[PDB]
């Protein structure tokens, strides 16, 4: 009795809610280039804070996805449009000795170029995956997407790379960071910590596996949704990073055509010809697969585990896809996913790989991009961190897992699992035995 109402401000109590998060860019770079300012995020471990997490449900993954789209749109906006290049192609492609690999070879056509009364013959090379065959004589070809979308050449001076990004909440909202070392994507976290901003997440763009990300604290971690076994994607996150290396040993020649926007095409190739390929530490790879199999048969009690390469679908999912700088790759990944199971740099694997220029935009089709050729020979090196698997149902008595993960949002889904955002509720009340004085 006599417990008079009292009020308290600055209260530590919060709730879940969506909000618009700040991005943050590096101090050096090539909206994004100079801003927002590079932070110095701190972090406290909180004593007894118990919070639940859900890496499938949280909103900010969608915001990452939208921001990536918007930034790509802004970067691509001032670049040239390749619409006048849509003319009929009359090409036979038998000049160089190693003809069959590319089969677009000085590939001829007409362009309007300097004077609009004039029309001039030109030619350049193309990889046949960027080409479709018209009816009648095979010499008649067309650009692949030109009957369905408008193609923009990438701005060569604005080459973009997986620059790390830190995400910062606004005032009144705090980002909760689970420090648990064996978090499965759902359930309580007893090791809650808070920060101004997230660490520097990179916008990696790849399929069937991811190339640049973080690593797990424990052993290889399995994360999947648990509403039903009939899942879309299963995320496997490596603790032991494994190196992968790739090469494009042939030397390219850049050539230019002006519309006065400078269109770039592929000139004559220099040096003897090889098919672009990759390399993998052979023992390390299927040591890691053995670890992943041992982890994976924990969930599934008493059934075999086996891998096969993906079947059907576009080139973006039938092959591992990634990019060394300003070139794009599609590596025929049959050998890597052919083990089977039941209830340290020797013997290096190599795998064949193809490259193509005209890329349907990753998140969604209907808008087309053209990457100008990169001169000379190219290699890039990365160290993978996880796999994107999907389970083939139906087959009784035998599980089967195959490389999928073509949907671009899953890459950032597998990396933003750390965090959650909460609205602060600074105002609260309580009973107490003291009242105002008149």
């Amino acid at each position, epitope marked *: 009795e006599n417990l008079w109402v009292t009020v308290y401000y600055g209260v530590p109590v919060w709730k879940e809610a969506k909000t618009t998060l700040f991005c943050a860019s590096d101090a050096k770079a090539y909206t994004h280039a100079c801003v927002p300012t590079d932070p110095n995020p701190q972090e406290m471990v909180l004593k007894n804070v118990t919070e639940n997490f859900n890496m*499938w*449900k949280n909103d900010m993954v969608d915001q990452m996805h939208e921001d990536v789209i918007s930034l790509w749109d802004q970067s691509l906006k001032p670049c040239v449009k390749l619409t006048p290049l849509c003319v009929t192609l009359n090409c036979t492609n038998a000049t160089a000795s190693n003809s069959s690999i590319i089969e677009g070879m000085k590939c001829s056509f007409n362009i309007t170029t300097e004077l609009r009364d004039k029309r001039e013959k030109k030619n350049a090379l193309f990889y046949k995956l960027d080409i479709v065959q018209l009816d009648g004589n095979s010499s008649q070809y067309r650009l692949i997407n030109c009957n*369905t979308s408008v193609i923009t050449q990438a701005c060569p001076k604005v080459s973009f790379d997986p620059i790390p990004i830190h995400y910062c909440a606004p005032a009144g909202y705090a980002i909760l960071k689970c420090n648990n070392k064996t978090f499965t994507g759902t359930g309580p976290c007893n090791n809650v910590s808070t920060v101004q901003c997230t660490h520097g997440i990179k916008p990696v763009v790849s399929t069937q596996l991811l190339l640049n990300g973080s690593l797990a604290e424990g052993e290889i971690i399995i994360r*999947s*949704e648990n*509403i*039903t*076994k*009939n*899942v*879309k*994607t299963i995320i496997v996150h490596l603790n032991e990073s494994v190196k992968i290396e790739c090469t494009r040993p042939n030397n390219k020649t850049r050539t230019s055509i002006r519309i006065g926007q400078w269109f770039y095409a592929t000139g004559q190739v220099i040096g003897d010809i090889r098919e672009a390929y990759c390399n993998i530490n052979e023992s390390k790879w299927n040591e890691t697969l053995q670890r992943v199999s041992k982890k994976l048969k924990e969930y599934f009690p008493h059934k075999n585990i086996t891998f096969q390469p*993906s*079947s*059907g*679908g*576009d080139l*973006e*999912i039938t092959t591992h896809s990634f990019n060394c700088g300003g070139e794009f790759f599609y590596c025929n990944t049959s050998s890597l996913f052919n083990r089977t199971y039941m209830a340290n740099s020797t013997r290096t694997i190599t795998i064949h790989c193809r490259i193509k220029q005209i890329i349907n935009m990753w998140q*969604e*089709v*209907g808008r087309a991009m053209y990457a100008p050729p990169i001169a000379g020979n190219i290699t890039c090196i990365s160290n993978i961190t996880g796999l994107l698997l*999907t389970r*083939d*149902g*139906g*087959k*009784n008595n035998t599980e089967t897992f195959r490389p*999928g993960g*073509g*949907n671009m949002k899953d890459n950032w*889904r597998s990396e933003l699992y750390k965090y959650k955002v909460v609205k602060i509720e600074p105002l609260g009340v309580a009973p107490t035995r003291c009242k105002r004085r008149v």
Partner: antibody, heavy 122, light 107 residues
Framework: QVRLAQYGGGVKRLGATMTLSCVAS????????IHWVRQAPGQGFELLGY????????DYAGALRERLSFYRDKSMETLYMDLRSLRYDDTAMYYC???????????????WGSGSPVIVSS | EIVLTQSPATLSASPGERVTLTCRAS??????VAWYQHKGGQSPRLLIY???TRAAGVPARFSGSASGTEFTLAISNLESEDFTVYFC????????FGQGTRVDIKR
């Protein structure tokens, strides 16, 4: 509002290969998995497989993985199914059905297609 | 691997009654069950998509509930139009379909 029309079918001769199709009315082509389910006469339904329209990934029932094939043409918002070497028992009606998918799981079917009867006989 | 035995084969009733349909799971399927209406040779239609939650646009007379591994669809007022076929469905695992049950006029 959403419609899933179908074409193809009719009679097909024994041992032949046949092609169905479904045209997705405008809801959003890339957001919903599509499943191909059928019904033999005097029997309950069963599933053949599902195709993700976005990336074109198929997946089949274990008893028909040699004979089936799915693929799409995203520009036309159109789907196709190829079944090879029709046998007698495959005389049945074949349906398209939209699937309601969450961010990480597939749940159930909401809108069925208009149907496509097929009869195997020479 | 998961088989839905839907029982009984046929249910006789008169208009306006409460009528019950049952779906038996071979083993556990959580709440991952649904129900559909099947017209006289047309597109099937959705009635109840979780174990109890009615689908949008369905009349309120349709209802169902979880019973552990058994699942039950109940229609409060079996109208003239509802004398047709209904089938249950599970989605905890690979997809499967029940045999379906007819509802017909009593005499």
């Amino acid at each position: 509002q959403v419609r899933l029309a179908q074409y193809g079918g009719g009679v097909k001769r024994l041992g032949a290969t046949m092609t169905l199709s479904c045209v997705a009315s405008g809801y959003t082509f890339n957001d919903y998995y599509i499943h191909w389910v059928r019904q033999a006469p005097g029997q309950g339904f069963e599933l053949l497989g599902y195709i993700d329209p976005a990336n074109g990934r198929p997946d089949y029932a274990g008893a028909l993985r040699e004979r089936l094939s799915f693929y799409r043409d995203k520009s036309m918002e159109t789907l196709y199914m190829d079944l090879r070497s029709l046998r007698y028992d495959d005389t049945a009606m074949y349906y398209c059905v939209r699937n309601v998918g969450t961010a990480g799981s597939l749940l159930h079917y909401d809108h069925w297609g208009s149907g496509s009867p097929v009869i195997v006989s020479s | 691997e998961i088989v839905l035995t839907q029982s009984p084969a046929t249910l006789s009733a008169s208009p306006g009654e409460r009528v019950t349909l049952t779906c038996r799971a071979s083993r556990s399927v959580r709440n991952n069950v649904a129900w559909y209406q099947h017209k006289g040779g047309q597109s099937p239609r959705l009635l109840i998509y979780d174990a109890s939650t009615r689908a949008a646009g369905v009349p309120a007379r349709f209802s169902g509930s979880a019973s552990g591994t058994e699942f039950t669809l109940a229609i409060s007022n079996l109208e003239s139009e509802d004398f047709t076929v209904y089938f249950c469905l599970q989605y905890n695992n690979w997809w499967t379909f029940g045999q379906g049950t007819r509802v017909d006029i009593k005499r």
